[PDB]
Design a protein around this ligand. Structure first.
Ligand SMILES: Nc1c(S(=O)(=O)O)cc(Nc2ccc(Nc3nc(Cl)nc(Nc4ccccc4S(=O)(=O)O)n3)c(S(=O)(=O)O)c2)c2c1C(=O)c1ccccc1C2=O
Ligand SMILES: Nc1c(S(=O)(=O)O)cc(Nc2ccc(Nc3nc(Cl)nc(Nc4ccccc4S(=O)(=O)O)n3)c(S(=O)(=O)O)c2)c2c1C(=O)c1ccccc1C2=O
Ligand SMILES: Cc1cc2nc3c(=O)[nH]c(=O)nc-3n(C[C@H](O)[C@H](O)[C@H](O)COP(=O)(O)O)c2cc1C
Ligand SMILES: Cc1cc2nc3c(=O)[nH]c(=O)nc-3n(C[C@H](O)[C@H](O)[C@H](O)COP(=O)(O)O)c2cc1C
Lengths: 210, 210
């Protein structure tokens, strides 16, 4: 069983609630499954090429029957890095996302990463009725840290980071998805110590059954 | 009146549906208000620094009473571009966003850009019970091209590009928002030109009253 620990939190001075819950999960999981391989993909220190003019130019050449050698050096580096992210994602059995909420969504790279892992012929295929996912036997956890409370109630409609990630996962075939919110620390800093520990305990219990 | 034509498509108007509708709008607007200054901001050719460890360290240095000289060169370059993006956005009266739907949302640079224009003490401020916007007297349009139909009905909930952009715009204080969808060209290919032209007509009529 291969697990991808995919994180999108910059290594700043302040610390990270999401990272603390994520590391607690991964350590608890590794204790339960000493034989499973865990791979850390840090999105702030991984090449995650955005779909741009070069990527469209590479795609236009593939459509025109030309190969990889017809691409420029920059184009070659871009699609090789895209394919390596894609292959890694396809090869894993389990995905664990760790994300902060910025501006009611996730950091930009998370979108860049999803645009890398959602590829025709690889994670979805076209049908008469539109694209359908190809992935089977997958399972995913999303750990999101938020300043306010969005897990339940009215504000759930504006938790765009969570809701989009679940949709893309669902699109490619991964609809067995767990969710752990580390929420309300900026709303109630007085109980941020207890919110973190409650989420850590919730993570350690899930690792025993993930 | 100053208008920001903010585009996030690596293809030009000859190559994209939304950009064709976008160009139809901005040109029809310009004839109607020849005095108005229109600035095109192509996000695929603008320095839009992602919030990272460098940016957080820089912010920590400004808060600590230290000045611009306290930052490394890379920190200086990132915060200088972030401030130029912020200044340009703040001083504008109108914003037109042109966006394609990729993977049920917008391209990552759009989020990166939103992270540049939603800053504390500039476009929003803190209160006892949460952040609230500062921008007054602004109006926005979002033009989005989509393969399927997300305008109304069941799939409106998975239209994350449209919904998140409106939320951030609404959060910073830009309440007056317009929306045009160039939709269903992939779902009904033999009806694609008539969709484009119907959307172009919708854009031209809006320009007279935007
Ligand atoms: N930097 C921050 C920070 S901080 O951690 O660095 O202080 C925090 C932070 N969020 C942030 C969220 C909530 C609160 N405080 C706060 N307090 C109470 Cl008593 N109630 C609520 N309500 C509240 C507000 C928003 C959402 C949900 C809820 S809730 O009702 O479900 O609790 N919020 C506070 S506080 O600093 O004013 O206390 C900051 C943000 C930001 C942003 O930079 C930012 C940029 C663009 C858009 C949004 C934000 C943003 O929200
Ligand atoms: N490259 C594409 C393209 S392409 O045509 O430009 O090659 C197109 C494209 N979208 C895409 C959207 C719709 C259809 N076709 C298609 N046809 C019918 Cl008869 N019905 C529907 N229904 C449909 C499908 C999706 C959403 C909504 C509806 S709708 O019924 O409410 O209109 N779709 C087709 S088709 O190629 O199979 O014909 C591709 C996508 C992609 C993606 O790369 C992609 C990546 C990640 C996630 C999603 C996508 C994606 O959706
Ligand atoms: C740039 C930035 C944007 C933020 N935006 C939001 C927001 O829109 N809503 C919210 O509730 N909290 C927001 N926050 C607060 C963080 O989500 C919160 O501190 C969270 O714990 C960060 O995750 P981490 O602790 O794992 O780093 C923001 C923080 C930063 C630095
Ligand atoms: C990389 C990529 C991802 C896409 N993802 C989606 C999607 O999730 N849903 C959808 O309906 N259409 C999707 N499409 C189809 C486009 O939304 C549609 O072709 C649209 O016209 C593109 O906008 P543009 O013509 O302005 O570039 C995708 C197209 C590309 C190239």
């Amino acid at each position: 069983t291969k697990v991808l620990f995919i994180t999108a939190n910059p290594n700043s001075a302040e610390g990270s609630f999401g990272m603390a819950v994520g590391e607690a999960f991964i350590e608890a999981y590794k204790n339960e499954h000493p034989q499973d391989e865990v791979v850390t993909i840090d999105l702030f220190n991984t090449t995650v090429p955005a779909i741009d003019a070069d990527v469209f130019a590479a795609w236009g050449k593939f459509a025109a029957g030309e190969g990889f050698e017809a691409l420029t050096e920059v184009q070659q580096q871009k699609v090789a890095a895209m394919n390596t992210n894609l292959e890694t994602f396809m090869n894993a059995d389990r995905y664990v996302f760790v994300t902060p909420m910025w501006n009611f969504s996730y950091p930009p790279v998370v979108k860049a990463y999803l645009d890398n892992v959602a590829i025709a012929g690889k994670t979805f295929k076209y049908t008469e009725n539109g694209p359908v996912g190809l992935l089977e036997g997958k399972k995913a956890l999303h750990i999101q840290a938020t300043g306010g409370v969005y897990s339940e109630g009215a504000y759930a409609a504006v938790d765009f980071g969570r809701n989009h990630l679940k949709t893309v996962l669902g699109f490619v075939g991964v609809n067995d998805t767990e969710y752990i919110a580390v929420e309300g620390m900026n709303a109630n800093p007085e109980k941020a110590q207890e919110i973190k520990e409650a989420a850590i305990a919730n993570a350690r219990e899930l690792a025993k059954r993930f």
